[PDB]
Structure formats: C-alpha cells, structure tokens
Amino acid sequence: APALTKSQTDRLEVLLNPKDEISLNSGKPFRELESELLSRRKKDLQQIYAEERENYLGKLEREITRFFVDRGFLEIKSPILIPLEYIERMGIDNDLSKQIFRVDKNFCLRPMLAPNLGNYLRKLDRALPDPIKIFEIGPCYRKESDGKEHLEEFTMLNFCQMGSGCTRENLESIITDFLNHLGIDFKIVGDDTLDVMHGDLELSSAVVGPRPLDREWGIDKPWIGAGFGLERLLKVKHDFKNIKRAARSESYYNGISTNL
Amino acid sequence: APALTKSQTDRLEVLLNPKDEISLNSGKPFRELESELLSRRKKDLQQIYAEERENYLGKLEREITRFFVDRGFLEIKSPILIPLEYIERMGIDNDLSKQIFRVDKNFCLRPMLAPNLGNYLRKLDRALPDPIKIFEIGPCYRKESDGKEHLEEFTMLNFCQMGSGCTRENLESIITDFLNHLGIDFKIVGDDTLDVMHGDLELSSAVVGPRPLDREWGIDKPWIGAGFGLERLLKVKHDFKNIKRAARSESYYNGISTNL
Ligand SMILES: Nc1ncnc2c1ncn2[C@@H]1O[C@@H](COP(=O)(O)OC(=O)[C@H](N)CCCCNC(=O)OC[C@H]2C[C@H]3C=C[C@@H]2C3)[C@H](O)[C@H]1O
Numbered sequence: 001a002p003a004l005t006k007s008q009t010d011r012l013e014v015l016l017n018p019k020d021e022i023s024l025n026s027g028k029p030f031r032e033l034e035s036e037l038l039s040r041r042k043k044d045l046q047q048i049y050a051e052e053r054e055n056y057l058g059k060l061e062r063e064i065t066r067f068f069v070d071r072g073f074l075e076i077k078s079p080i081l082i083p084l085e086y087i088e089r090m091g092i093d094n095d096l097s098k099q100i101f102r103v104d105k106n107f108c109l110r111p112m113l114a115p116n117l118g119n120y121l122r123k124l125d126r127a128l129p130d131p132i133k134i135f136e137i138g139p140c141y142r143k144e145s146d147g148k149e150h151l152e153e154f155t156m157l158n159f160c161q162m163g164s165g166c167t168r169e170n171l172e173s174i175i176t177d178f179l180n181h182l183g184i185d186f187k188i189v190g191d192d193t194l195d196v197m198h199g200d201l202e203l204s205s206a207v208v209g210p211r212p213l214d215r216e217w218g219i220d221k222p223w224i225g226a227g228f229g230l231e232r233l234l235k236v237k238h239d240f241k242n243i244k245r246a247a248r249s250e251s252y253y254n255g256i257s258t259n260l
Numbered sequence: 261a262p263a264l265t266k267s268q269t270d271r272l273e274v275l276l277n278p279k280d281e282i283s284l285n286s287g288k289p290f291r292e293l294e295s296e297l298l299s300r301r302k303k304d305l306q307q308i309y310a311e312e313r314e315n316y317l318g319k320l321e322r323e324i325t326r327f328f329v330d331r332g333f334l335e336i337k338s339p340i341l342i343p344l345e346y347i348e349r350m351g352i353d354n355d356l357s358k359q360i361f362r363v364d365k366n367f368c369l370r371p372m373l374a375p376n377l378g379n380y381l382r383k384l385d386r387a388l389p390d391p392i393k394i395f396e397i398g399p400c401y402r403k404e405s406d407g408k409e410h411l412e413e414f415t416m417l418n419f420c421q422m423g424s425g426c427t428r429e430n431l432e433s434i435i436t437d438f439l440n441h442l443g444i445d446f447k448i449v450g451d452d453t454l455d456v457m458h459g460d461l462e463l464s465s466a467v468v469g470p471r472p473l474d475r476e477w478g479i480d481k482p483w484i485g486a487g488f489g490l491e492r493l494l495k496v497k498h499d500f501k502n503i504k505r506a507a508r509s510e511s512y513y514n515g516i517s518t519n520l
C-alpha cells in the first residue's frame with residue numbers, strides 16, 4: 001500500500017463531500033478510492049436531477065428575496081455594468097483601484113451594489129413614504145488579492161433603509177432575524193461600522209450612517225445598510241472547504257464536481 | 261393653448277403608462293399635463309411599495325425557473341464573465357465580433373448562454389440519465405447595432421435537451437406550453453431553425469440539432485434548444501413602447517419612471 005501522492009489526494013479532495021466519512025490514509029489504492037467517490041458523486045447528481053433540480057445559488061437568492069420583500073423591502077435590479085465615475089464618486093481615485101474590471105473608457109463591472117442603491121434612495125425619496133427600504137441581489141466583480149475566501153465573480157446582497165428607524169439596534173435586529181432565518185451562526189463585531197463574522201470568515205460589512213460622502217449621492221437623511229456575500233453564506237451553510245464550490249462555475253454544481 | 265413642443269411631448273412620454281387613457285393634443289398646458297402624470301406615477305410606486313414589492317425582471321426569472329424545474333429541467337448558474345476562446349469556438353473569428361465586450365486579453369462578457377450550456381451537457385452526460393434537460397437564465401452582453409429593440413445589457417433564458425425526444429414537435433410543444441403559461445401571444449416561423457415572433461418582435465431563436473460544430477463541445481447526440489429574452493417578454497406582457505422600460509435601470513422601476 002504506497003501512500004497517496006499529493007496530486008492524488010488533491011484529486012480525491014475534488015470528489016470529496018463533507019458528510020462522506022472517508023479518511024484517505026487507510027490502505028486502499030488511489031484507483032479504488034477514486035472509483036468509490038465517483039460512484040457516490042454520480043448518485044448525488046442523479047438525486048438532484050430526479051428530485052430537487054434547483055441551483056443552490058439561485059435558490060438562496062430567492063429565499064433571501066422572499067425574506068426582504070416580506071419585511072417591507074423593495075426589490076431592485078439595477079445595471080451590472082456601470083460608469084467608472086460612480087466608483088470615483090465613492091471616495092476612490094485611479095491610485096483598491098487595481099481591483100476593478102474596466103470594460104471601456106467610461107465603464108466597469110460593478111464591484112459593489114451601494115452606488116446604484118444610493119441613486120435609487122435619492123430618486124424614491126420623491127415618491128415613497130418614510131422609511132424607505134430597498135435591497136438588491138446580484139453579481140459583483142473584483143480582481144483578487146487573496147483568493148482563499150475571495151472570488152473574482154461573486155453575488156452580493158445589499159439592503160438599505162433611509163429616514164426613520166435607522167439605528168444600530170435596528171440594523172442588528174434585521175441582521176439577526178435574517179441569519180437566524182437562514183440557520184447560520186454568527187457574531188457581530190466592528191472594524192458605526194460593523195462586521196458580521198462566522199469564525200474568521202466575514203459574512204457582511206454593515207454601516208449606520210450618515211457618512212460624509214452621502215452628499216455626493218444627494219443623500220442627507222439617516223440610513224443603515226449591509227452587504228452580504230451569497231457564496232460565503234453557502235460555504236458556511238453547506239460546510240464547503242473551498243468557496244469555489246459555491247460559485248458560478250463549470251466545475252461544480254451545488255458543490256459536486258462536474259469532472260466525473 | 262400653444263401646441264406642445266417636441267421636447268415637452270418627449271417628457272410626457274417618459275411619464276406615460278399604456279393604460280392611462282390620456283391624449284396629449286387636448287388643450288391644457290404642459291405644466292398641468294406633467295403635474296397630472298407625476299401624481300399618478302408617484303401613486304403607482306406607492307402601491308408597489310405598499311403591496312407587491314417585487315421587481316418585474318426578478319419576478320419573471322422566478323416564474324420561468326419554476327416552470328422549467330417542474331417540467332424536469334436542471335437550473336444552471338454559470339459564469340457571466342467567460343473566455344474569448346468559447347466565442348472563437350462558436351464559429352466566430354476576430355473579423356458579429358465588434359459586438360463583444362472584452363474585459364481582458366482572454367476574457368469577455370458573455371453574449372450568449374449556449375457555450376456554457378454545451379460544457380454542462382458534455383459533463384453531465386457522464387452522470388445523468390437520458391434525456392438530459394437543463395436551462396439557464398441570466399445576463400448577456402452585446403454592443404448594439406440597432407437599439408430600437410436591443411439592449412446592451414439583457415437577460416436571456418436558454419433551455420436545452422440532449423439525447424432522446426429531441427424533435428421539432430417536442431421543441432414546439434415546450435415553447436407553446438411555455439408562452440401559453442406566461443400568457444404571451446406568438447407564432448413560430450423559421451429563419452431546422454425556428455423563430456418565435458410576436459408581430460415584428462423576435463422573442464426567441466430556436467434550433468433542433470445536430471449542428472456540425474457540435475464536436476467542438478464534445479457533443480455527438482441529438483439536441484434541441486431555444487433562447488428567449490426576458491426584457492422582450494416583459495415589453496410584450498406589459499405593453500411597453502420602449503424595451504428600456506423592461507431593463508435593469510436606474511431610470512425605470514417596473515416600467516415607471518424614477519425621474520419624478
Ligand atoms: N471578492 C469576494 N468574494 C466573495 N465575497 C465577497 C468578495 N468581496 C466581498 N464579498 C462579500 O460581500 C461583502 C460585503 O462587501 P464589503 O464588505 O466589501 O462591503 C461592501 O463592498 C459594501 N459596500 C458594504 C455595504 C455596507 C453598507 N453600505 C451601504 O448600504 O451603501 C449605502 C449607500 C446608499 C447611499 C447612502 C450611502 C451609499 C449611498 C461581504 O463581507 C463578503 O461576504
């Protein structure tokens with residue numbers, strides 16, 4: 001029984017699921033271990049195809065949407081491709097900034113939802129009663145400096161409230177109800193600025209305004225907001241070792257390798 | 261009563277809804293006509309905020325998802341940002357091609373869902389029983405040559421079946437059930453290649469394979485597929501004059517101007 005090589009164990013870890021109950025220094029050749037795990041992963045995909053058929057990331061988006069709509073928040077779908085000026089406007093200059101995917105001279109793939117939400121807040125203040133509550137869920141793009149927990153293409157939820165009720169207590173209560181509903185453990189810290197943590201993993205950054213650069217979006221009321229990464233939430237919900245398993249991918253479906 | 265100017269009537273058309281019942285050469289000054297329409301549009305947004313709260317485009321995606329999942333199709337969420345090579349692979353060369361948003365030397369914003377679906381078809385053939393049925397819904401990107409009915413940022417549905425049952429009759433039956441479920445009138449033409457039309461407006465292009473370039477994706481079985489634009493479907497469902505009203509936008513919410 002030769003020990004598994006490092007590339008072999010890497011291969012097996014692609015096919016490994018958290019609830020497998022299989023330790024890999026146990027006698028059997030690579031080929032049998034591989035063959036066992038393929039068989040199981042095929043079965044996993046067959047079950048999904050026979051019974052559920054929903055993608056985890058689409059499903060989560062829909063669960064989150066239902067949660068915020070039911071709690072009085074308006075669902076936004078704004079452009080993914082935005083003007084660079086909105087980023088400049090957000091404090092940043094062309095010298096953080098090497099993380100943006102530029103598309104054209106004036107355009108980039110949004111790295112955040114906050115700018116478009118700001119515009120929606122300003123415009124809806126003319127139409128809607130206090131408080132104004134809104135959220136968006138969708139793709140954001142950042143070129144990685146880390147990549148251990150970081151994706152270049154990810155999916156954020158960002159919710160906002162403007163006008164009355166915009167306190168820390170209220171912001172914590174929304175966050176708390178929200179993660180309790182999803183069944184994800186968390187603690188709230190701060191880096192008012194708050195961070196919502198699952199062990200060493202950041203689920204969300206959150207803010208209670210006002211912030212000085214509010215006036216750049218025509219915002220002059222109290223507000224509170226928070227952004228969450230859906231793939232981070234999945235990683236924790238499904239106990240994935242690597243966040244790549246939670247992403248838009250051609251290599252994983254609902255965390256199951258597609259290279260079988 | 262001076263006639264309305266062209267810019268004034270343009271302004272009023274932004275605030276106009278299909279079911280308004282208001283003709284604009286009728287005596288009253290611009291300012292009263294404008295003021296009337298603002299009042300109505302504010303009310304419209306208040307009702308949405310008080311009662312529904314769902315975005316039309318998110319809502320449609322969810323309705324379509326439910327329809328295909330229930331009919332045996334697996335929900336895909338694949339990368340939006342893809343390699344240029346997948347486009348080259350799709351027949352095209354660097355000399356159609358001025359329509360692609362390049363991001364980097366090797367990457368672009370996908371103009372279609374078909375390539376990623378092809379990879380999913382090949383990989384799942386090793387795991388799933390015949391027939392294999394899948395779909396994706398999500399953003400696609402094309403630089404416009406027209407723009408009357410064309411958005412740069414749009415949302416496509418693309419479904420596929422591979423193996424058995426991949427006939428024209430079957431493809432028409434799926435399309436037919438699908439649009440009847442949504443309540444959208446259509447006829448099926450062809451430009452086998454099929455086009456699904458609402459008057460002069462293309463809702464979908466559809467294909468019954470095999471096609472010769474199938475082998476470039478490792479596909480050697482019978483297949484059928486169809487792509488639909490969600491914003492085109494909304495334009496027709498809600499009787500919008502301009503498809504911009506159906507898009508991801510900071511200027512319209514569920515077809516209602518946000519510049520109030
Ligand atoms: N690469 C990645 N891979 C995976 N997940 C990632 C990745 N990168 C981030 N994440 C995930 O997403 C991260 C959240 O993103 P950030 O922490 O980077 O924070 C923000 O950017 C928001 N601006 C915070 C919003 C705070 C409230 N702001 C706000 O509400 O805007 C207010 C606006 C309305 C008007 C008033 C003022 C303005 C205008 C999660 O931690 C991580 O899970």
Ligand SMILES: Nc1ncnc2c1ncn2[C@@H]1O[C@@H](COP(=O)(O)OC(=O)[C@H](N)CCCCNC(=O)OC[C@H]2C[C@H]3C=C[C@@H]2C3)[C@H](O)[C@H]1O
Nearest residue numbers: 372374378410411414463464465467485486487488489492
């Ligand atoms: N700019 C726009 N603005 C608004 N709506 C738009 C816009 N542009 C398009 N639309 C909307 O979207 C359009 C549909 O897009 P196209 O007509 O441009 O057609 C396709 O591209 C698909 N390849 C057809 C898929 C055909 C089946 N192929 C397929 O299934 O792929 C098979 C793959 C699996 C493997 C086997 C072979 C390969 C690999 C609607 O007409 C319009 O409403």
Ligand SMILES: [Mg+2]
Nearest residue numbers: 202204205206
């Ligand atoms: Mg942060």
Ligand SMILES: [Mg+2]
Nearest residue numbers: 462464465466
């Ligand atoms: Mg076409």
